[PDB]
Amino acid sequence: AGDFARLSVLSQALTLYEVEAARLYNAVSAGAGIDVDAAQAAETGDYVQTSA
Amino acid sequence: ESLESLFTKDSDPTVLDAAEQFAQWTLPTVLTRDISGMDGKRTSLHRDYQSTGAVLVNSASTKVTNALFPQGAPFFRFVDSPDMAAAVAELGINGTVQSQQSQIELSASSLVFSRDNYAASLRAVKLLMVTGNALEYFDEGTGRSHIYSVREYTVRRDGSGNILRVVLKERIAAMDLPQEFRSAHLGQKDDYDDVTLYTGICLEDNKFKIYQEVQQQQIGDASTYPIDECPYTVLVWNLVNGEHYGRGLVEDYAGDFARLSVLSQALTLYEVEAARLYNAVSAGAGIDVDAAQAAETGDYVQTSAAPGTNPGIWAVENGSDRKIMSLQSEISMIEQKLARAFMYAQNSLGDAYSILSDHWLRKRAYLYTVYQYPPMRAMFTLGATTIQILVGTASLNKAAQADRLLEASQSIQLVLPVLQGATKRTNPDAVVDFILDAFGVVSSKLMYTEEQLKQIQDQQ
Amino acid sequence: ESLESLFTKDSDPTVLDAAEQFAQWTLPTVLTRDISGMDGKRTSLHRDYQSTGAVLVNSASTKVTNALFPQGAPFFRFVDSPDMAAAVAELGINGTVQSQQSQIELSASSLVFSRDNYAASLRAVKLLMVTGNALEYFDEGTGRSHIYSVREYTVRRDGSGNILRVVLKERIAAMDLPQEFRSAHLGQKDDYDDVTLYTGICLEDNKFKIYQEVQQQQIGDASTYPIDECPYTVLVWNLVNGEHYGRGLVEDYAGDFARLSVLSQALTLYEVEAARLYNAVSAGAGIDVDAAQAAETGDYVQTSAAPGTNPGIWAVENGSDRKIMSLQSEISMIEQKLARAFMYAQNSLGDAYSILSDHWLRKRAYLYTVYQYPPMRAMFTLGATTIQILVGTASLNKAAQADRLLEASQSIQLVLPVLQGATKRTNPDAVVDFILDAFGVVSSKLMYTEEQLKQIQDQQ
């Protein structure tokens, strides 16, 4: 029973960590001066001005 | 008291919702979401983000169907009984009793590979593993088998778990209805007008009464069948005690499938992020963007950056390149576990396989046998309900005894000559009897008895 | 009432759009988008950025066509029955009844390789895999099979799924019409014009009715064929309950194809970005650009940069060099999954293969058998209701009997001499009968009967 309980706890933790790792979100820095409006389209090769 | 009311009362929407979810996980085409009102149009199916489940279910269906109905080998064996021996003679088949039994067996078993029956068996297995519930109706006339999903029929069970009432709902064209019924009631329906045909099965005085109604009016005469001879067969994969409806295979691994779907969606999003391409331009670098944009053929573009470094225009190194390998590795681990669970030999499957090869093949053997040989029906149960069959893996029984006899013969060949040549005190009959008893071989089925041995001792 | 109105009513634009999308993902030439009104001119096919789907579909269709119609061996066999024996004998074929049946099956099966039927069969398989629907017509006069895509015909079904009305829209030359009809209505069209020949199939009194009309004018008589021998044969890959048109195999993996297309477009864009070459020149480096642009021989070019470093003119290495490997790896994973889904042995495919082998082959086997032997039409149509056939993988049923006979013979050879030499109490006939019964082979079919055995004894 103890092995099964440990397996259940570890499986729950692994599921939570998988959910956390599956999260995708982009971070934008205001000080970098990146043209966020032009950069959000992209996907073709467009030239986007940046201050970095 | 109408069949529509009984179908409404016995219906479990939760079972339908769970079956729809499982199908959407594995095979959306197995069970859709109430496409009756679409007037036979192509409904939009929301396929899941991962296709592993479809492959796993297809492989499991093929393997299970092959195991249940092997090709070139009948799936049920008649047991050696005097009652069967007396009844097989009145069948119009020449040869010995063993040959007649083998011929009837092969002819009955080959019916599953005769007319769209193998496809019906495959669809039934697919429904049983995915949905968990299935129902077949063996038409006595043509000999075909039709498989209905849980959406088309309902079952009511007692506390013990026996079948009490089964109601089937199917939409058919008005042509199938008798002309008198259309003339009387459905006078506004054309030939191709689609109407409901409720079929009801009820248990009363240890028999199943089957009758059909259209618009709450019965058609034809209510025929009755016993439990063993009921054309309709209800099938369950895993039946919880006290529950009318069984549980499917994928329900056991629902959480793993959900985790795989979430991981696959995240992987798709990360691949979309990685496929994004754009070049960032730094104004402070001083790169001549108006001339660097053309380039292509390797022109000389002026830049103010330090020599040997980036001119000022560079492809954006997106951060989504990593975490794709980790997501793929986790998805691979989940898929490996599922494949281990989906046998991608009758051991990963628990009682579900045993249930399948104890009731489905048993009544299939009867229906197939009586269809090929109508006289067998009376002698089977109507005359004397004593003939027994061995369906499933239990069919490969007498082959085990043949192998045991071969092993006993090898042991006899190894032992008896030595004891014979050693001395005359040894009894060869005692030695062979001892070997056969040790190997558990029925010597009476392959040795002359005392009666005919004495007959050949005088007539010689 | 006109066939044009029925064709317009039964047509489903959603099915056509889905078929067009699936064809675009796969082989794009299978089903185009309304090129009828362009006078046979070449149309620009917007091919998808992926090229794996075409190869997968080609390989899968070729393998499935090979499986359905194995070369050399017949694709259908006759079951042994006394009704079939009498009918087959009255044809003029010499030899035993089994030899006559084998020759008839071989001759009927060979017709699929005679007149552009294998090509038509493979085209139908491709259409069923991609589009999901196909219509087959066997010209009983010449012996050729024609395949029509879902764009050129419509299907109306009832609730059960039976065929009620089928309307076929095909474009033919004006000369094909009878002279009387041309003089009646189509008197303004010369030989090389286009007319729309509408063919309709209606279910009236369990007998399909076939008649053709052009411009709402019936042409000729209205021949009627029963269900089992209608030359038209509607084929579906995956038939959803209640719907009129089937769904193809490609639909099961539409998301994978869409992801592959997106990733292929991204990879093409990144390849274009990486292929770009342009030189960046730094004004502060002091590089003699005029002298450096010639080079290519070993000339000495003055520069103001530190020795051993970049003079000031360097090829720009952009950031798209990476993320090409990641995109290629993800595309390879998707292609591996698709190839496993497209069986790149009949187990990856679902119940669709079983349905095709049960309906398409049974109908096809009948027509070739009747076409080869015109007298064979009335054999099992007017009478002989017991005449049945085995199609698909179930046709190889007698080979299983031969294998069982081989195994039983080996067992008898191993066992019987040992028991015979052990004692005289054994019964060789009983041992042989027991072994044959255990192995399930029909013993009476391959040995003397009791009546004729006494004839040998009477005649010594």
Side-chain angles (χ1 to χ4, degrees), chain B residues 217-220 222-272 274-281 283-295 297-316 318-320 322-330:
Chain B
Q217 287 69 240
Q218 194 192 297
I219 62 184
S223 71
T224 177
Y225 286 91
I227 297 89
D228 280 2
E229 293 82 3
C230 182
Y232 295 77
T233 306
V234 63
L235 311 164
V236 304
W237 183 265
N238 189 359
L239 192 139
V240 178
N241 198 62
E243 287 204 323
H244 310 318
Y245 297 85
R247 308 295 185 93
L249 202 159
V250 296
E251 191 196 280
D252 283 318
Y253 317 99
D256 313 278
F257 268 112
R259 296 167 51 215
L260 172 60
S261 285
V262 168
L263 291 184
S264 303
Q265 174 181 2
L267 174 66
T268 314
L269 270 177
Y270 268 105
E271 294 177 324
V272 176
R276 186 208 296 275
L277 177 72
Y278 70 111
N279 313 84
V281 187
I287 174 65
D288 189 8
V289 65
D290 302 289
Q293 59 106 25
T297 61
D299 300 65
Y300 280 62
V301 182
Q302 186 269 327
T303 178
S304 180
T309 70
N310 192 250
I313 307 175
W314 72 104
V316 176
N318 198 238
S320 61
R322 184 176 179 179
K323 204 173 287 292
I324 298 186
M325 303 308 166
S326 66
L327 273 172
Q328 283 283 30
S329 67
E330 192 66 31

Side-chain angles (χ1 to χ4, degrees), chain C residues 153-187 190-203 205-227 229-281 283-316 318-320 322-325:
Chain C
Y153 78 96
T154 61
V155 164
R156 161 143 293 271
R157 298 176 187 265
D158 54 62
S160 66
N162 295 319
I163 294 295
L164 305 168
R165 191 175 40 226
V166 171
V167 188
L168 169 78
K169 184 178 184 293
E170 65 183 1
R171 275 178 60 240
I172 63 169
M175 65 184 73
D176 291 331
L177 293 154
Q179 183 49 248
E180 311 86 310
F181 197 90
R182 279 197 75 187
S183 49
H185 323 275
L186 277 296
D190 64 358
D191 274 297
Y192 300 136
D193 291 331
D194 186 74
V195 296
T196 61
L197 180 72
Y198 275 102
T199 310
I201 304 100
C202 281
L203 182 44
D205 189 358
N206 54 357
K207 276 208 174 48
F208 279 125
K209 182 175 73 175
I210 313 187
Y211 67 107
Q212 299 169 355
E213 66 183 1
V214 159
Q215 285 173 215
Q216 295 99 310
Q217 293 303 20
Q218 171 143 350
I219 301 167
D221 48 355
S223 65
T224 65
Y225 301 85
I227 295 95
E229 51 265 9
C230 182
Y232 292 143
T233 313
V234 55
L235 303 178
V236 290
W237 190 263
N238 262 6
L239 193 44
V240 186
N241 265 327
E243 275 180 58
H244 300 346
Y245 301 96
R247 316 225 186 193
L249 171 83
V250 172
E251 170 158 352
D252 286 27
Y253 318 99
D256 293 28
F257 275 131
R259 295 162 63 228
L260 205 51
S261 188
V262 171
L263 291 183
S264 297
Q265 183 188 43
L267 177 56
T268 288
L269 272 173
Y270 268 91
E271 279 161 290
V272 176
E273 175 75 9
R276 156 177 272 136
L277 179 61
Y278 81 96
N279 288 284
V281 192
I287 177 62
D288 191 3
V289 54
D290 303 338
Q293 66 97 19
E296 293 179 353
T297 303
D299 313 328
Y300 283 44
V301 164
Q302 179 266 316
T303 185
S304 175
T309 80
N310 200 252
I313 303 172
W314 76 101
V316 175
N318 72 90
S320 77
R322 164 131 171 181
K323 186 175 174 66
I324 295 182
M325 295 298 102

Side-chain angles (χ1 to χ4, degrees), chain B residues 40-43, chain C residues 9-12 243-245 247:
Chain B
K41 285 283 161 262
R42 198 203 186 241
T43 61
Chain C
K9 184 163 41 83
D10 299 3
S11 71
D12 186 74
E243 275 180 58
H244 300 346
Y245 301 96
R247 316 225 186 193

